[PDB]
Design a protein around this nucleic acid. Sequence first.
RNA 1: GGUGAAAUUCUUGGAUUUAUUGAAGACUAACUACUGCGAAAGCAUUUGCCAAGGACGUUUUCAUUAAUCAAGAACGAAAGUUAGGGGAUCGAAGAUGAUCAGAUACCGUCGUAGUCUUAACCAUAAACUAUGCCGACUAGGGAUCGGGUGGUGUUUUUUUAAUGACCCACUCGGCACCUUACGAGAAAUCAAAGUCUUUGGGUUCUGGGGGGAGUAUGGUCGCAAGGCUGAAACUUAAAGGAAUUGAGGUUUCCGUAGGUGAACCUGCGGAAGGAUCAUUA
Lengths: 283, 181, 216, 128
Amino acid sequence: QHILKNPLVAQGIVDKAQIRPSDVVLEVGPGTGNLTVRILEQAKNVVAVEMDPRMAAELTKRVRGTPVEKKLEIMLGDFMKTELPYFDICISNTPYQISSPLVFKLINQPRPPRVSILMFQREFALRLLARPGDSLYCRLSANVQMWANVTHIMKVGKNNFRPPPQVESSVVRLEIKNPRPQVDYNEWDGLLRIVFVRKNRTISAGFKSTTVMDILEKNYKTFLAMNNEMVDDTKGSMHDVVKEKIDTVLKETDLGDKRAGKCDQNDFLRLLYAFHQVGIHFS
Amino acid sequence: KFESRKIMVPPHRMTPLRNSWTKIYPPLVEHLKLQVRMNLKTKSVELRTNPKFTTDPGALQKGADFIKAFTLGFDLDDSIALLRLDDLYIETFEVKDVKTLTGDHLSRAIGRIAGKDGKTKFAIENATRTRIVLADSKIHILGGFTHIRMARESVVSLILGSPPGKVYGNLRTVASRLKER
Amino acid sequence: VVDPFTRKEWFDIKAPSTFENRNVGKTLVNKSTGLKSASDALKGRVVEVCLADLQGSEDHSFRKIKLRVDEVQGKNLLTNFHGMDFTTDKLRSMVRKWQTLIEANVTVKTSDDYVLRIFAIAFTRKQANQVKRHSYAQSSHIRAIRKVISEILTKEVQGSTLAQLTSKLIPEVINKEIENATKDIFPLQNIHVRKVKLLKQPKFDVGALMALHGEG
Amino acid sequence: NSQVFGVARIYASFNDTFVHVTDLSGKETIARVTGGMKVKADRDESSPYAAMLAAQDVAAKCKEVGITAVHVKIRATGGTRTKTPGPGGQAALRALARSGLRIGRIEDVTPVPSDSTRKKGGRRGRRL
RNA sequence: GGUGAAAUUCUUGGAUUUAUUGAAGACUAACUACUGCGAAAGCAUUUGCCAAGGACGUUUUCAUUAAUCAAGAACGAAAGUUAGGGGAUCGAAGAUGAUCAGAUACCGUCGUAGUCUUAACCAUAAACUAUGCCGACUAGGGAUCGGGUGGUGUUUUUUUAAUGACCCACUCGGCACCUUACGAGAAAUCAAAGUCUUUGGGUUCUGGGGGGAGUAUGGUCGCAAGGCUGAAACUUAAAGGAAUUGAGGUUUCCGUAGGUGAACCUGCGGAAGGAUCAUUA
């Protein structure tokens, strides 16, 4: 439990949220309340979700007598299990343990929000803001570059919190792409998992393990199952034949010597299409 | 219905055994009534019972466990306490069966187990009511089942590399928790 | 609800004529009902028994004999030799510090088609006037001792069948032969043939079994 | 001299204790009761009390089936583990002695390796 | 099964256990020592083959051919990279169990790469004796490894003759050990860390407060990972260090690889800069 005690960076967080007076705000993790009241002042409706009933009671006690009392809604329960209402923008000051999944929760939401101001860890913010070719470009970086757009805003020091933690915090701004890309999500996630199981090997060496070949063989059996074609002869299992098929794919993508951490977006998209025309799928 | 138990003794335990021999064969025949032989040709001890003695096979088993505890290197009074009670058991394990330490690491681990003048080991002797004897690399713990379990937990946690201050605090905690129940 | 223990019967397992105590013990088999005979189920068992129970005297208490099972008739099932092993505590008593452990093994087919492997062990000692604590052996002595042990073992087992082999293994004259052969190379206390085992077998040969068995 | 012989395996692991009486061979087993089927707490199946109870029950079963003499062999879980029987096996042996059953040829048969494959823990040991 | 207490998991198509047999790959327990070998990393089943090496012994040869070493080169733990191989165990990543103030007693099952090998790379470790190499001198003792010398000393020959083993004495070359100060040091301590304010045997490499930082730029090598070289601006003067005596978690690290709650966790290998009691000799 940490409390943002700095009364100076909070105004910058407020003004960098880009709130017009006709927005709906999902203000997740209100904290003490140094940030929520200005959002009530400059937005027509704010819906905040709180896990502590005592702190929600304190927050709804703080708004008594204030003219923005009737524009605040308070939801209870865990964030990853409730159904969110309609909201235009998002502001997150959550504990860091829910950092990794919930950004994908901002991805999979129907009618996704326009802008979100997120307070994350320094390592997590550097991993999200990681260009290809650097030392921090990972699967999460490629996923957030696919389904969103990220921009760091300012640094947050250690001595700006009560108590001052060991790590440094960061403020990032995320926008969901409107419209979203028409690539299929779980195939992309499986492809990135396979190619980013090791950041520094080549793609051809990354397609030599037993489990990846077995799951691709199962996917090929499933594809031939709903496409209704009989499996031809093979020396052992048929995936060995698919091995040369995979080999043939690595003769036009030219990615058998390139590496996952040093490849940009277009090479991954071309490689995914390369499995797409040869009837190889990940999910 | 004579029953015989053959117990083999290491040669390096032979010389203390004789120095305690006159201490051990009279009690074995005055409160236990089992006939004893020391066969130096095969370097062993024969424990035999006959129905002319006390009708008690558990007496023979207790004598066998007593001399098995003695031949591992335990003290005489601890083996006598094993004879008098029915609860005392002997855990036996090694340093390498917990975590592989080789070379000077094994020597440092044994020195951590013993400590200065053995006193850290003696601390366990004051905190678990057990009896720990150290071989060259094997260790043996004698006592009650929960007592040897907690002594094993302490000595295993100390083997891995934990400082003696942490196990001192753990021994104080378990001495406070065990004396009240 | 079934209680198969009342269904099962007992059988008496016996030892060959080489050992003095040719009665081993008792086992239990199910009934020879339909589609499952009792004779075929008694062709793969291997019993084990200490040699002191087969010879009476306690000087062979550290050896144990594994016996096969060969032919059952008239509530009596007759066996054959399958192997000899040492008890583990005997090895833990024999192997002590400040001495050299010499081990040898030889695979030999006998006069009949009994392919066997033989394991022999030896240790070093001090000859009663030695102030030196350890008395190890140089590797040249160890290699020569291993060569002599191997040639002695293959000479002993190559020119004979298993019957006289085990009737020589009972009084352990091979240890005396090895000690006398290697007495001019190093002292070498405590020689034992620690393990023998069958590896390859000929056909059933009921005539040899009836020659070996058929007593009582 | 009408003595019927069998053998008895005492498998004393960390969290269980198996008693297993058979004939001279390992074929055609007679009785096998563990510490888990004599107590219901999920914690005292490794306790010597449950081992002694199981040994008493298997001794009654062995007495009623007919075998009146056992050659007992004791072992731990062996392999790359402790390779020495714990208190459960000793308690089971003492309870078999309490049964009055004939016992001979004390021998341990724990599987010792000749520096076999790696054990669990991964260079830091089991944080026990 | 498992753990402090659970759960996932397999199981009346028989789990676990017992008995016989087989296959696979990995590793060489006990013997194992303040023992041995190698330039270091490192090296442990048997036997055979090939080449190599130290020490000893020599009334053998040549007669300075030598020592240290910029350039340049060979080898170089583990991890890591590109292909081929089989892939048992263990097992980063991952999939899943419950998170119970207390996890003190932060785990479970399956398991990819890897672990093993062939052909190419890389060139780093607490790669440590934290002690360059060659040469000489200086103090007492007991063990021990290899060679050599002497013993009308011992034992096994089946005749007490060679040898082998043991004992005693000496000697050369090693691995170390115990005490002490002729001395040295700031001290812990040191037979060198001595032969030094009374200072010189030869030679190579390095250092000249701590962050910033082995970071930035440039060069070179490497498929990459990264290796070699290598700053400055700004900042501290109650600043950095070496040895000794007067709410939770708590072994400290190094090379390497991967992943994120709370700058942590885990896999391989290495170090102590960590506290040896009891028995025997």
